[PDB]
Design a protein around this ligand. Structure first.
Ligand SMILES: COC(=O)C(=O)N[C@@H]1O[C@H](CO)[C@@H](O)[C@H](O)[C@H]1O
Ligand SMILES: COC(=O)C(=O)N[C@@H]1O[C@H](CO)[C@@H](O)[C@H](O)[C@H]1O
Ligand SMILES: *Cc1c(COP(=O)(O)O)cnc(C)c1O
Ligand SMILES: *Cc1c(COP(=O)(O)O)cnc(C)c1O
Lengths: 810, 810
């Protein structure tokens, strides 16, 4: 149908059809008379998968022959989403498969909706890992993603009575056609035990053993015939485990629980033993695999020349002491040489500055679970502090501030300090974030080793986030500038010469309208909810958290509602406000915010006077597959975190690339986005980081804003009086109390400027032509935010490898 | 190579080779450079599996079109063993696959050894179910085997320090290529809750739900293109299960534990809650599936005409009250009509008379777990006893003897009584066993309803137990009488006309020698143990149990050893005594018997004076695959259970068909085997059932035998003095105490006659020609013991269906 979706050759369509029927028969063991839609989905999945194998086998054989430096990206999260369409896009098989299934009397889009999301992540951090794998494959890097194969990913969110209900994400129920179990590479992981000091070296003995079984999933590059690997470990008990009889067998579950479920927290540290076990589990299995592959290429001096380990935050920080343990205890290298190798091999990426999100493990936990690692950590700390003492003689407070060991009620290990000490590079994920790291939380470290600190602004893959989810936009763009931009997003700048092109302006606006119509229909299909496609689609989708300030958005919504009730027959630009995102199960305030949102909708959506001028919808179960649907349909992107709290943000980039204008604070990547597009083409408002600091020094007093802003006072009084909760008048008392007495994120402080800015948005929307021209200016300057640019910088500035755009023989 | 293995056509060999390479590439994602033997095994398995699908799909379509009466065999055990070779045999692909793999540079036999046994059974009862499935498919019956897909089957037995060690049988570790998950047919099973009595009928409410997910495995008939199904249920927790968050997800294990492991008991009842849950789990899921299929053919009067349910012992006895529950509570049929349908639908097979093996569930357990079923059972009992009271007025003791409810310390439900009352047919598994049922334990029931009692002597499938495990013997036989006997075993009688044929006599003897050489080599390969292939192979393989009397065998072995030590330079026929079998983990005496056996071997195998004249080997981890190796190599089959205890026995039939002579008591099927072959061609000894009864009436006094038999006294003194356990003089004190004071199985009573009989065996072995002629007479008369004969009788006399030998279009 459309150009960017590839060719539908006669030979290929014929081949696809026969292989489809072959799998339906031999693989699914079914006939066209009893086959269900799910059966057809699997037949198609296996058919597409077949096209990957040849390339997958030769890519790996290629790396063996050339032996390039290997990149290992360690993460406890890989938010992959669905794999079928992405695979077709990267293999240029979309139109062929669409035609083939069409001829078989099937609708491919219907089949794609059957695939379960691989939701092995919470949000931004996990999705970044997924985008990175795509880019590393597209740039021809010998990269491997290593993680855990959770039996249950992020929970499926259900809304009952306006409240969030959690249900298990049994994503493997019907099977996973993309993965390939590799039991032959199963490795042992040790826990507990004790340390024994012998004549020659220490020994970790009397440990409990848990097996790590790997499952490999192919990661295809964009049309370059490269297929890398994502290896996820699954926990298995040894067969002699606990070996009355029956109980011993049933207790195998204890060991296998390690890979059972993903901790559902976004930007929040929960110091539970099971989580620590998961972190060591992935690190121990991965490092053995890395060393095994290295030897199969004694001379560990060349280890850093053949290996690069990237730590996605501190979750896999134990890789540092584990590498030391192996090199020192097992390989018998002297400490100094081992440390040199470790530092040159490891690099650390920080993803937040919120104190509650930093990992600080209790010493008593490490002491019992990983006794040898604790000893190695104390030794690392000892030698590191000796270096600090030599550089800053007499500065005793600096010593206690930089220590990896934190004193107090209970001693803890600051994992971030461990990562900085044992890594040759430390980076933030957006310019402002990286600067904050050097100026605040990591200031002492920056002063000791300035060369270690870098910035690597985040990005998103234009394959999944443009071509896959918005083919209509990808097509009108390709029509003007070709298809080269898909793997060289900077070329979108050429669109700047079409900002005055009446034809282009019309096409851009038409694509958006079509996306909105499609999404508007979807809402009624799977969720039975009516919305006016002519209204401005105002959306804020991301995990629910106080720092992201969904509450500020709520305040604006209520303001709009009160204004309409005050002057009913006054014209206002129609809006459909959409808010979606999951709240961590144990995050009470976050769950209350969800209830507030649905409560507001209950009132606003049923008020006769409002009509179709204002609608408030809460998008249930926001996940990757849902993002691919709502983002292309958005007009306004809400990125309103308090300045200095959102390290980078990536959802913001997805909206910019898909034709939505942005209203937001100068926080995270928003700053660079506005810089690229021009501040006049962005809706910036609120306090800057400096303004927040000034307020804190003076003391934030929410009462002041309440006393001086009549409209704000009214909203708070409505909340307190039960206006939004008739049967439960004090239902939102906790929210009001927090806002009024202990709001760490200063919601009230940005209220006035936010509302004013929103009026400017409605003003521009009333002028279709000018709204679209500003949109074009945003799309045209979103090139910098491609994860291909991000990965190329990591490759050259951190890993020491050169990216390649060369195709491999298919 | 050999005739009976089929043709190796050029076209087929070429096709097999290409499909083998296809699966290695696309299915296993590997190349010939990194493929391991396990990889090659799977490539072959998938290749053979492909040949089954077409036939499997059309067989099921066939049953849908013709709608014949369906046979449902319910069992908690299906001891299948390996599937690859069996599939090739039934599809006549063995030589083709052998040639194809040969050309690819691979040894098929080596690949077959890689497959894990599907050990979902304990012994005889579970293997009978497996043989039955094979025969039902070969006889063209629309049969379905229903059971549980245990994650862990019978434990793998390891021998350490002469003691049995148990280790988990993780048979699904590398995957199961034969099964096909059918999540689309997942069904709910209810537990706990309470009964609510409403205006119209009772309702079972507030129950906990566990999902039953089916996995289908194909069951090919012998060269008739019929492929039936074995459906095994797997337990799955619902997604809203227990829905802090993490714990709720981890607790899903509680529900899924139902299908986690097989209870490892042979002829022993263990009243644990988990076992009861397994029994109801299989019954509830299966019955819903049966009824669903029935409706997809309201008129339950025709239910018995379209459905037959065979209960393999009482394990699935809850099918009776569950069927009543569904018909009465859900379908709204009146009790009397529902009962009529239930009785006409169900049939029960008893497999033992040992009191400790009978199921008697505590009322308090059923009361809590299945409240509605308990009520239905009380009602059934009430109406049944009313019938008894009317037939035998005033006989109050008969009423208490026949009640389904047993009074006493704790009230229990006698499941056997439940089965007899709710079944239209009850059968024993050997003529003598069925007679004992009518004369003793079920006497009262037989007097009330004589027409219900039948006999169906057991059998074994000649496919796995002759053609598959002993191709050499199958070939020399086919050379003389053709291949028709493989599916019409009675034709072996034609071999009687070759008993004087010098050529045949030589071939029979040659095949046995080759089998012994192969097995003798195997022992050194995987177990490093030397044995003299020229000796008589004396073997007893079966589960370890006191009633099977492995101890009597031990006494004979020690006798032989003492005699040699007494007259060292006297000639004796060399023997290799092999004993193997697993002991239930909680069966202490059984574990002590294993230790005694290895202890005897430790002494006998290292005595210089004995030389290679006597060897005692304990065959580790006896299972189906091992049986296929040792049985064809045996000369003497030990079937020495105390008369009246072995219901039938089936191992005895396997040995008879494979050229071994039998030494045994007139117990179980041994009686019919001797009757078929002629008592002069069997080595019978010991007390008959009548003799055992006389002894019990008089009182068994073991001391008497000890006082009057010098050789026996010596053995007991050696055991007591520590002769076989130097470091632990009283190690076998429990064994001696049991033998001397509380031996329920009268080991001593048959000692003298057993030893005398064994001398007659050694005498015949010294005459090769006559030994072989007697062997021929046994093989020639083993036809009656084919499970095809057994199934044909069940079909005509119980299920009301006619077996068919007609091929289906392939
Ligand atoms: C440990 O931090 C987190 O939980 C987390 O998800 N952080 C997130 O990581 C993303 C990728 O760098 C950033 O864009 C987000 O701003 C940051 O909050
Ligand atoms: C519940 O009984 C058992 O545990 C069991 O395995 N019984 C066995 O069943 C076999 C098949 O009929 C018979 O041949 C054996 O003699 C009987 O002991
Ligand atoms: C892109 C993405 C995120 C990150 O969004 P931010 O607004 O940067 O927090 C979270 N969840 C999903 C499903 C995403 O696709
Ligand atoms: C045939 C068989 C049995 C039954 O043997 P009996 O001697 O009748 O108890 C038990 N186990 C296995 C593995 C078998 O093949």
């Amino acid at each position: 149908q459309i150009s960017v979706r590839g060719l539908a050759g006669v030979e290929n369509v014929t081949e696809l059809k026969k292989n489809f029927n072959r799998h339906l028969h031999f693989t699914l063991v079914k006939d066209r008379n009893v086959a269900t839609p799910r059966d057809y989905y699997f037949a198609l999945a296996h058919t597409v998968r077949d096209h990957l194998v040849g390339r997958w086998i030769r890519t790996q054989q290629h790396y063996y022959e050339k032996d390039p430096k290997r990149i290992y990206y360690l993460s406890l999260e890989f938010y992959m989403g669905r794999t079928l369409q992405n695979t077709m896009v990267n293999l240029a098989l979309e139109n062929a498969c669409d035609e083939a299934t069409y001829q078989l009397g099937l609708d491919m889009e219907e089949l794609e909706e059957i695939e379960e999301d691989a939701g092995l992540g919470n949000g931004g951090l996990g999705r970044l890992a997924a985008c990175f794998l795509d880019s590393m494959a597209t740039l021809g890097l010998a990269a491997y993603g290593y993680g855990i194969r959770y039996e249950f990913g992020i929970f499926n969110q259900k809304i009952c009575g306006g409240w969030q209900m959690e249900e298990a994400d049994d994503w493997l129920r019907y099977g996973n056609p993309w993965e390939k179990a590799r039991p032959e590479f199963t490795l042992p992981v040790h826990f507990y035990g004790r340390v024994e000091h012998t004549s020659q070296g220490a020994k970790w003995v009397d440990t409990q053993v848990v097996l790590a079984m790997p499952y490999d999933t192919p990661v295809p590059g964009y049309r370059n015939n490269v297929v890398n690997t994502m290896r996820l470990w699954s926990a298995k008990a040894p067969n002699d485990f606990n070996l009355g009889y029956i109980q011993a067998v049933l207790d195998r579950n204890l060991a296998e629980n390690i890979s059972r479920v993903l901790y559902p927290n976004d930007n929040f540290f929960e110091g539970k033993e099971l989580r620590l076990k998961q972190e060591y589990f992935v690190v121990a299995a991965t490092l053995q695999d890395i060393i095994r592959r290295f030897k199969s290429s004694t001379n560990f001096d060349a280890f850093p020349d053949k290996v690069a380990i990237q730590l996605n935050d501190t979750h896999p920080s134990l890789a540092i002491p584990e590498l030391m343990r192996v090199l020192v205890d097992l390989e018998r290298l002297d400490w100094d040489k081992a440390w040199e190798v470790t530092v040159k091999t490891c690099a650390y990426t920080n993803h937040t500055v919120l104190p509650e999100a930093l990992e600080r493990w209790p010493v008593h936990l490490l002491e019992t679970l990983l006794p040898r690692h604790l000893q190695i950590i104390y030794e690392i700390n000892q030698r590191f502090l000796n270096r600090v003492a030599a550089a800053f003689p007499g500065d005793v407070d600096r010593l206690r501030r930089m220590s990896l060991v934190e004193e107090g009620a209970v001693k803890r290990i600051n994992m971030a300090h461990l990562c900085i000490a044992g890594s040759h590079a430390v980076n933030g994920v957006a310019r402002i974030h990286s600067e904050i790291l050097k100026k605040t939380i990591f200031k002492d470290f920056y002063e000791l080793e300035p060369h270690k600190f870098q910035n690597k602004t985040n990005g998103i893959t234009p394959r999944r986030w443009l071509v896959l989810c918005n083919p209509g936009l990808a097509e009108i763009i390709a029509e003007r500038i070709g298809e080269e931009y898909i793997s060289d997003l900077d070329q979108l700048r050429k669109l700047l010469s079409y900002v005055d092109d009446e034809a282009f302006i019309r096409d851009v606006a038409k694509v958006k309208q079509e996306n909105k119509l499609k999404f508007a229909a979807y809402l009624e299909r799977e969720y039975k909810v009516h919305i006016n496609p002519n209204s401005l689609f105002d959306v804020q989708v991301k995990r629910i958290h106080e720092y992201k300030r969904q509450l500020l958005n709520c305040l604006h919504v209520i303001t709009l509602y009160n204004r309409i009730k005050k002057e009913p027959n006054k014209f206002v630009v129609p809006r459909t406000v959409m808010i979606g995102g999951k709240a961590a199960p144990g995050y009470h305030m976050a769950k209350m915010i969800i209830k507030l949102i649905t409560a507001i909708g209950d009132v606003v959506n049923h008020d006769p006077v409002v009509g179709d001028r204002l609608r408030v919808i809460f998008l249930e179960n926001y996940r990757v597959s849902l993002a691919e649907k709502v983002i292309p349909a958005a007009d306004l992107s809400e990125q309103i975190s308090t300045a200095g709290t959102e390290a980078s943000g990536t959802g913001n980039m997805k909206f910019m690339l898909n034709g939505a204008l942005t209203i937001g604070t100068m926080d995270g990547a928003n700053v660079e986005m506005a810089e690229e597009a021009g501040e006049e083409n962005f809706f910036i408002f609120g306090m800057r980081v400096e303004d927040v600091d000034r307020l804190d020094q003076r003391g934030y007093n929410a009462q002041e804003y309440y006393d001086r802003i009549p409209e704000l006072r009214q909203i708070i009084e409505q909340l307190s009086s039960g206006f939004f909760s008739p049967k439960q008048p004090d239902l939102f008392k906790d929210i009001v109390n927090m806002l009024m007495h202990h709001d760490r994120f200063k919601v009230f402080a940005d209220y006035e400027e936010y509302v004013k800015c929103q009026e400017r948005v409605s003003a521009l929307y009333k002028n279709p032509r000018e709204w679209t021209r500003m949109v074009i200016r945003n799309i045209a300057t979103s090139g910098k935010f491609s994860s291909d640019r991000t990965i190329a910088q990591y490759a050259r500035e951190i890993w020491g490898v050169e990216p390649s755009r060369q195709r491999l023989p298919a």
